Amino acid sequence: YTMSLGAENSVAYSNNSIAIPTNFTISVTTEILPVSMTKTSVDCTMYICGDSTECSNLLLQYGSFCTQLNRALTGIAVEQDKNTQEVFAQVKQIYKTPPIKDFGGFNFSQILPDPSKPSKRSPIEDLLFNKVLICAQKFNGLTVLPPLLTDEMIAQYTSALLAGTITSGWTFGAGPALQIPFPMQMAYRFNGIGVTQNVLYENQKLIANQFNSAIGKIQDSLSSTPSALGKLQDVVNQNAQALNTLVKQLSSNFGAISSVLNDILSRLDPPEAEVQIDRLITGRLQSLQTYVTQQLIRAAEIRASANLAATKMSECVLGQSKRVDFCGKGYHLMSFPQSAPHGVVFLHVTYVPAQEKNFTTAPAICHDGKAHFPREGVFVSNGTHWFVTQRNFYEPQIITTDNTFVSGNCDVVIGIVNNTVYDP
Amino acid sequence: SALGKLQDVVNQNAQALNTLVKQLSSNFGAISSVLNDILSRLDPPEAEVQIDRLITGRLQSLQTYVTQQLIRAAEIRASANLAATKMSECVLGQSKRVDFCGKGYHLMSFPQSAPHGVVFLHVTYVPAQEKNFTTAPAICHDGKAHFPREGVFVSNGTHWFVTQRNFYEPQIITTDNTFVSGNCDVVIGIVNNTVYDP
Amino acid sequence: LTGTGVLTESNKKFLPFQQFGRDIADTTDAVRDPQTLEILDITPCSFGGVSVITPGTNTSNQVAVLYQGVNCTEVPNVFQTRAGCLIGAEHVNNSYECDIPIGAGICASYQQSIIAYTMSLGAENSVAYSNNSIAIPTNFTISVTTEILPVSMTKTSVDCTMYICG
Ligand SMILES: *[C@@H]1O[C@H](CO)[C@@H](O[C@@H]2O[C@H](CO)[C@@H](O)[C@H](O)[C@H]2NC(C)=O)[C@H](O)[C@H]1NC(C)=O
Ligand SMILES: *[C@@H]1O[C@H](CO)[C@@H](O[C@@H]2O[C@H](CO)[C@@H](O)[C@H](O)[C@H]2NC(C)=O)[C@H](O)[C@H]1NC(C)=O
Ligand SMILES: *[C@@H]1O[C@H](CO)[C@@H](O[C@@H]2O[C@H](CO)[C@@H](O)[C@H](O)[C@H]2NC(C)=O)[C@H](O)[C@H]1NC(C)=O
Ligand SMILES: *[C@@H]1O[C@H](CO)[C@@H](O[C@@H]2O[C@H](CO)[C@@H](O)[C@H](O)[C@H]2NC(C)=O)[C@H](O)[C@H]1NC(C)=O
Ligand SMILES: *[C@@H]1O[C@H](CO)[C@@H](O[C@@H]2O[C@H](CO)[C@@H](O)[C@H](O)[C@H]2NC(C)=O)[C@H](O)[C@H]1NC(C)=O
Ligand SMILES: *[C@@H]1O[C@H](CO)[C@@H](O[C@@H]2O[C@H](CO)[C@@H](O)[C@H](O)[C@H]2NC(C)=O)[C@H](O)[C@H]1NC(C)=O
Ligand SMILES: *[C@@H]1O[C@H](CO)[C@@H](O[C@@H]2O[C@H](CO)[C@@H](O)[C@H](O)[C@H]2NC(C)=O)[C@H](O)[C@H]1NC(C)=O
Ligand SMILES: *[C@@H]1O[C@H](CO)[C@@H](O)[C@H](O)[C@H]1NC(C)=O
Ligand SMILES: *[C@@H]1O[C@H](CO)[C@@H](O)[C@H](O)[C@H]1NC(C)=O
Ligand SMILES: *[C@@H]1O[C@H](CO)[C@@H](O)[C@H](O)[C@H]1NC(C)=O
Ligand SMILES: *[C@@H]1O[C@H](CO)[C@@H](O)[C@H](O)[C@H]1NC(C)=O
Ligand SMILES: *[C@@H]1O[C@H](CO)[C@@H](O)[C@H](O)[C@H]1NC(C)=O
Ligand SMILES: *[C@@H]1O[C@H](CO)[C@@H](O)[C@H](O)[C@H]1NC(C)=O
Ligand SMILES: *[C@@H]1O[C@H](CO)[C@@H](O)[C@H](O)[C@H]1NC(C)=O
Ligand SMILES: *[C@@H]1O[C@H](CO)[C@@H](O)[C@H](O)[C@H]1NC(C)=O
Numbered sequence: 001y002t003m004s005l006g007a008e009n010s011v012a013y014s015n016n017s018i019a020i021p022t023n024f025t026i027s028v029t030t031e032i033l034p035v036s037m038t039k040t041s042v043d044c045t046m047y048i049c050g051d052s053t054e055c056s057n058l059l060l061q062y063g064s065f066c067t068q069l070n071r072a073l074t075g076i077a078v079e080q081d082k083n084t085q086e087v088f089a090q091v092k093q094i095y096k097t098p099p100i101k102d103f104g105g106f107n108f109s110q111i112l113p114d115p116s117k118p119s120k121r122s123p124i125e126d127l128l129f130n131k132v133l134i135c136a137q138k139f140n141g142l143t144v145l146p147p148l149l150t151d152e153m154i155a156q157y158t159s160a161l162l163a164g165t166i167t168s169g170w171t172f173g174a175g176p177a178l179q180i181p182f183p184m185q186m187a188y189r190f191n192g193i194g195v196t197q198n199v200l201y202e203n204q205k206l207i208a209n210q211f212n213s214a215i216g217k218i219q220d221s222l223s224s225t226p227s228a229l230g231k232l233q234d235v236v237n238q239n240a241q242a243l244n245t246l247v248k249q250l251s252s253n254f255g256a257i258s259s260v261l262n263d264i265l266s267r268l269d270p271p272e273a274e275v276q277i278d279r280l281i282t283g284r285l286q287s288l289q290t291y292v293t294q295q296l297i298r299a300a301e302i303r304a305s306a307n308l309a310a311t312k313m314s315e316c317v318l319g320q321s322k323r324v325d326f327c328g329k330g331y332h333l334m335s336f337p338q339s340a341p342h343g344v345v346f347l348h349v350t351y352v353p354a355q356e357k358n359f360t361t362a363p364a365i366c367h368d369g370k371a372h373f374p375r376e377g378v379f380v381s382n383g384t385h386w387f388v389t390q391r392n393f394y395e396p397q398i399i400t401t402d403n404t405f406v407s408g409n410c411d412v413v414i415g416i417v418n419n420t421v422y423d424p
Numbered sequence: 425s426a427l428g429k430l431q432d433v434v435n436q437n438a439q440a441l442n443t444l445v446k447q448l449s450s451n452f453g454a455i456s457s458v459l460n461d462i463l464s465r466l467d468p469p470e471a472e473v474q475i476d477r478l479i480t481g482r483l484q485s486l487q488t489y490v491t492q493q494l495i496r497a498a499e500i501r502a503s504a505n506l507a508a509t510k511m512s513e514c515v516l517g518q519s520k521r522v523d524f525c526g527k528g529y530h531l532m533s534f535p536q537s538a539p540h541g542v543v544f545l546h547v548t549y550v551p552a553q554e555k556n557f558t559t560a561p562a563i564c565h566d567g568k569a570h571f572p573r574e575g576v577f578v579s580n581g582t583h584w585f586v587t588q589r590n591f592y593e594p595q596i597i598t599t600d601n602t603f604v605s606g607n608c609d610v611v612i613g614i615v616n617n618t619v620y621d622p
Numbered sequence: 623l624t625g626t627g628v629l630t631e632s633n634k635k636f637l638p639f640q641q642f643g644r645d646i647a648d649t650t651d652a653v654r655d656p657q658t659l660e661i662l663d664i665t666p667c668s669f670g671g672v673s674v675i676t677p678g679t680n681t682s683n684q685v686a687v688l689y690q691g692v693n694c695t696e697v698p699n700v701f702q703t704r705a706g707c708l709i710g711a712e713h714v715n716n717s718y719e720c721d722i723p724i725g726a727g728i729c730a731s732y733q734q735s736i737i738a739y740t741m742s743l744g745a746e747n748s749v750a751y752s753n754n755s756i757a758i759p760t761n762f763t764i765s766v767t768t769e770i771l772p773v774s775m776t777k778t779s780v781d782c783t784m785y786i787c788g
Contacts, residue, residue, distance in 0.1 A: 041671060041690075051626050062481065063450035064443050068488070071439075081723065090523070093747040102753060104612070136647035139666050143691050146704050146726040153727055156743055167751040174528050175551040178757035179749050183612070184561060184576065188589070197571045198605035201561050204612060251648045262624045278453055289488065296495050304502065311524075319522030395605075429770045437776045444780070459788065475787075482786040493778070500775045507771040526767040540774045546767045551759035559756040576756060592760040613754065 021353035046141030083306035095163035105208030173318030254283025452481025677732035686710035
C-alpha cells in the first residue's frame with residue numbers, strides 16, 4: 001500500500017478562539033542510546049602469520065602496517081572507555097537516598113537499586129540487562145578487553161545521579177548538592193515549564209499517581225516488547241558479524257594452494273612457499289585493513305551517540321531543558337538515567353496537555369479607555385464572563401490591576417474588547 | 425599536560441606522516457625499495473614486475489593514509505562544530521544548558537586562540553556556603569493559601585521569610601511577593617503564619 | 623595435519639567416519655588419533671597481549687606488566703584480575719581515584735612502588751533529605767573553567783605520482 005503519513009487533523013483556527021488545557025498527564029518516554037562498543041584487539045602478526053617465522057619475516061617487507069593497525073584498534077578501545085566515562089562519570093560525589101523513601105507520594109522503587117540481590121541494580125535495569133563463540137574468535141589472536149567501568153560501577157553511577165536528582169534536584173549538577181523536598185522540586189520544574197506551583201500542589205496526589213503509573217507502563221513495555229532495545233542489540237550484532245567475517249577470511253585461499261599456512265610450510269620449500277605465503281599475506285592484510293576501517297567508522301558513530309548521551313545526561317538529568325523534543329516528547333520536567341549493556345536508557349518525565357476546551361480570546365481589554373494586557377497569562381471568555389488564566393493550564397481568575405499592565409489606549413490594539421478591570 | 429587535546433592531534437598527524445614516509449623504505453616483495461636502483465639495474469621485462477610490486481605497496485600505504493586522514497578529519501569537523509556552537513551559545517549569549525558552558529550556572533565565556541584550536545574560559549556562578557532551613561509549600565494566613573511568586577518560604581526555626589531560590593536573602597512575607605490560589609485544606613504541608621499587607 | 627597447541631581429552635561425540643573437527647571459526651579444534659581411536663581437543667597454546675604499566679621516566683624506572691586475558695599459572699606481587707595477570711604491582715584494599723587504567727574496575731598508580739586497586743567512583747555524600755528542609759546558599763564563588771577544543775588539522779597534501787613514482 002501507499003503508506004499513510006498520519007491521521008488528518010484540521011485545526012479550528014479563528015482570530016478569536018484559543019484552546020487551553022484543563023487537565024494534564026505525566027508521560028514517561030524511553031530513549032535508548034549506545035554509549036560504548038566492544039573493545040576488540042587483534043595481533044596483526046598473529047592473525048596473518050600465526051606461529052610462523054617465515055611468514056613473519058615476509059611480513060616485515062610491508063613495513064609498519066601491523067603497527068598502525070594495532071594503534072588504530074588501541075585508539076578505538078581508549079575511545080570506548082572515554083565514551084563511558086563521559087556519559088556516566090558526571091557526578092563528583094556518590095549520593096545515596098535516605099532509608100525512609102517518603103517522597104510526597106512519588107514512588108521510585110522501579111528505578112532505584114534493590115539490595116536484595118548480589119548486584120545492586122534496579123528492576124528496570126535488570127530487564128535491560130536480561131533482554132540484551134568467544135573461544136572460536138579468541139583462538140586466532142582476536143582478544144576482547146574488559147571495560148574499565150564494570151556493570152556494578154555503571155549501576156553505582158546511575159544510582160548516585162538518581163539519588164542526587166531525587167534529593168537535590170538540579171543543584172548537584174552546578175555545585176554542592178542542596179537538599180530539597182521533592183514536591184517543591186517538582187514545583188520548580190512546573191515553574192520552569194510555565195505552570196504555577198498551585199497546580200502541582202492542589203493535584204499532588206493525582207500527579208504522583210500518574211507518575212507511578214507511567215513508570216509501571218515502562219516496566220510492562222520493556223517486559224513485553226522484544227524489539228525495544230534494538231539500538232543496542234544492533235551494535236552488538238554488527239560487532240559480532242565484523243569479528244565473524246574477519247575470522248572467516250582466514251579460510252580463504254586468495255589464490256594460494258591452501259588457506260592453511262602450516263600445510264604450505266609442511267609441503268613446500270622457501271622458493272615456492274614464499275610465493276604462496278605472499279598471496280596469503282596480501283589477502284589477510286586486506287581483510288584486516290577492511291575490518292579496522294569498518295571499526296573506525298563504527299567507532300566514530302558510537303562516539304557521536306555517546307556525545308549525544310553525555311549531552312542528554314547533563315541537560316536532561318542534571319537540569320531541566322527547554323529544548324523541544326531533546327528530553328522526550330512533551331514539556332520536559334525531569335529525566336532518570338538507567339544503565340544498559342553498552343549503553344544508557346533515559347526515562348524522560350514530561351508534562352503533556354490532556355483535556356481540551358475552546359475559549360474566546362482577545363489581545364487586550366479596554367476598561368477606562370486604557371489598554372490592559374495580561375502579565376503572565378491570556379484573557380479568555382467562556383461566552384459571558386472574561387477571566388485571565390495561565391497559558392498552559394486553565395485556571396480562570398478575576399481580572400485585576402495586579403495581574404495586568406497598561407500601555408497605550410484602546411484605539412491601537414486590533415481585537416480589543418470592552419470589559420471591567422477591578423482594583424481591590 | 426593541560427593542553428593534551430591539541431598536542432594529541434598534532435602528534436597523531438605527525439605519526440601519520442612519519443608512517444607514510446617510512447613506508448617508502450619497504451620492499452613489498454621487490455628486490456629493492458629504491459626505484460632508481462631497480463631502473464638502473466634492470467631492463468623493462470623485469471623492471472616492470474619489480475615496479476608493479478612497489479606501486480602496489482606504495483598505493484596501499486597512501487590509501488591507508490588518506491582513509492585515516494578522512495576519519496580523523498571527520499572527528500576534527502565534529503569538534504569544530506562543537507566549538508562553533510559553544511562560541512555562539514557561550515560567548516555571544518548566556519546558556520541555560522547544564523554543563524555545556526562550564527560546570528556551574530553559566531554567566532559568560534571568553535574565547536582564546538590556541539594552536540589549531542580554541543580555549544574557552546567559562547565564568548560560572550557556583551553556590552558556596554550552606555545553611556539548613558525549614559520550608560513549607562504554602563502559608564495559611566486567613567484561610568487562603570499563599571504561594572511565593574519568585575522564591576521559596578523558609579524558616580530559621582522561629583520566623584518565616586520568603587527568599588530567592590539561589591541566594592539566601594530573607595524578606596518579610598507580604599502580599600506583593602506572594603499570590604493566592606485556593607484554601608488551606610488542599611495543600612499538603614501548609615503552615616500557619618502571618619502575611620503582612622503594607 | 624600440523625600445528626602447535628595443547629591436546630586434551632575430548633567429550634565430543636564424533637561419528638565413526640569423522641577424522642578431525644572444526645570450531646565455529648572454521649579452524650581445526652579436534653583430531654582423531656591415527657593409532658588409537660581417541661578424540662582429542664586441540665586448544666591453542668596460551669597467548670595474549672603484553673602491556674607495560676609505568677609512571678613516567680621523570681619519576682621512576684619501575685614498571686608493572688599486564689598479561690591480558692592470561693592466567694597467573696601460565697606466565698612463567700602477582701595479582702590475578704579479570705583483565706589478566708598483573709605482575710609487579712602490589713594489590714591493596716584501599717580504593718583511590720583512577721590514575722593508570724588496568725581494566726575491569728582496576729587502576730594502578732605509583733605511590734614508593736606501583737600499586738593496583740579497585741578505583742573509587744568518588745566520595746560518598748548522603749544528602750540530608752526530609753520533607754520540610756531546604757538548603758539555600760548564603761554566599762557564592764565565581765569560577766572560571768578551561769575547556770580546550772580542537773578546531774583544525776594540519777593541511778597536508780601528497781602528490782600521488784610523486785610519492786609512488788618519483
Ligand atoms: C484529570 O485526568 C485524570 C486522569 O489523567 C483524572 O483522573 C481519573 O478520574 C476518573 C474520574 O472520572 C477516575 O475514574 C480515574 O480512576 C482517574 N484516574 C486517575 C489516574 O486518577 C482526573 O479526574 C481529571 N481531572 C479533571 C478535573 O478532569
Ligand atoms: C512502590 O512501587 C512498588 C512497585 O512499583 C510497590 O510494590 C508492589 O506493592 C504491591 C502491594 O499492593 C504488591 O502487590 C506488588 O507485588 C509490589 N511489587 C513489587 C515489584 O514489589 C510498592 O508497594 C510501592 N510503594 C508504595 C509505598 O506504594
Ligand atoms: C462563565 O463563568 C462564570 C463564573 O463561574 C459563570 O457565572 C456563574 O454561573 C453559575 C451558573 O452555574 C452561577 O451559579 C454563578 O452565580 C455565576 N457566577 C457569577 C459571578 O456570575 C458563567 O455562568 C459562565 N458562563 C458560561 C457560559 O459558562
Ligand atoms: C467599547 O466601548 C466604547 C465606548 O466605551 C465603544 O465606543 C463607541 O463606539 C460607537 C461606534 O463608533 C460610537 O457610536 C459610540 O459613541 C462610542 N462610545 C463612546 C462613549 O464614544 C466601542 O465601540 C466598544 N467596542 C466594542 C468592540 O464593543
Ligand atoms: C530568625 O530571624 C529573626 C529575624 O532576624 C530573628 O529575630 C531577631 O533576633 C535577634 C536576636 O539576635 C533580635 O535582636 C531581634 O530583635 C529579632 N528581630 C525580630 C523582628 O524579632 C530570630 O532570632 C531568628 N531566629 C533564629 C532561631 O535564628
Ligand atoms: C493552622 O491553623 C488552624 C486554625 O486557624 C488550625 O485548625 C485547628 O485545628 C484543630 C485540630 O483539628 C481544631 O481543634 C481547631 O478547632 C482548628 N481551629 C479552628 C479555628 O477551627 C490548624 O490545625 C493549624 N495547622 C497547623 C499545622 O498548626
Ligand atoms: C563570601 O565568601 C568570600 C570568599 O569567597 C568571603 O571573603 C573572604 O572573607 C574572609 C573573612 O574571614 C577574608 O579573610 C577573606 O580574605 C575574604 N576573601 C575574599 C576573596 O574576599 C566573604 O566574606 C563571604 N561572605 C559572607 C557573608 O560569608
Ligand atoms: C472547538 O470548536 C471547533 C469548531 O470550530 C470544534 O471542531 C472543536 O471540537 C472544539 N474544541 C473543543 C475542545 O470543544
Ligand atoms: C474575526 O473574524 C471574523 C470572521 O470570522 C470577522 O467577522 C471579525 O471582524 C474578525 N475580528 C477582528 C477583530 O478582526
Ligand atoms: C543540615 O542537617 C543535617 C542533619 O540531617 C546535617 O548533616 C547537615 O550538615 C546540615 N547542613 C548544614 C549546612 O548545617
Ligand atoms: C514530614 O516527615 C515527618 C517524619 O520525619 C512526619 O512526622 C511529618 O508528619 C511529615 N509532614 C508532612 C506534612 O507530611
Ligand atoms: C594401529 O591402528 C589400528 C587402526 O584401527 C588400531 O586398531 C590398532 O590398535 C593400532 N595399533 C597400535 C599398536 O597402536
Ligand atoms: C622532571 O625532572 C626534572 C629533572 O630532569 C625536574 O627538574 C622536574 O622538576 C621534574 N618534573 C616533575 C613533574 O617531576
Ligand atoms: C587459573 O587457573 C586455576 C587453576 O590452578 C583456576 O582455579 C583459576 O580459576 C584460573 N583463573 C582464570 C582467570 O582462568
Ligand atoms: C583485604 O581484606 C581481606 C579481609 O576481609 C583480606 O582477607 C585480604 O587479604 C585483603 N587484601 C589485601 C590485598 O590486603
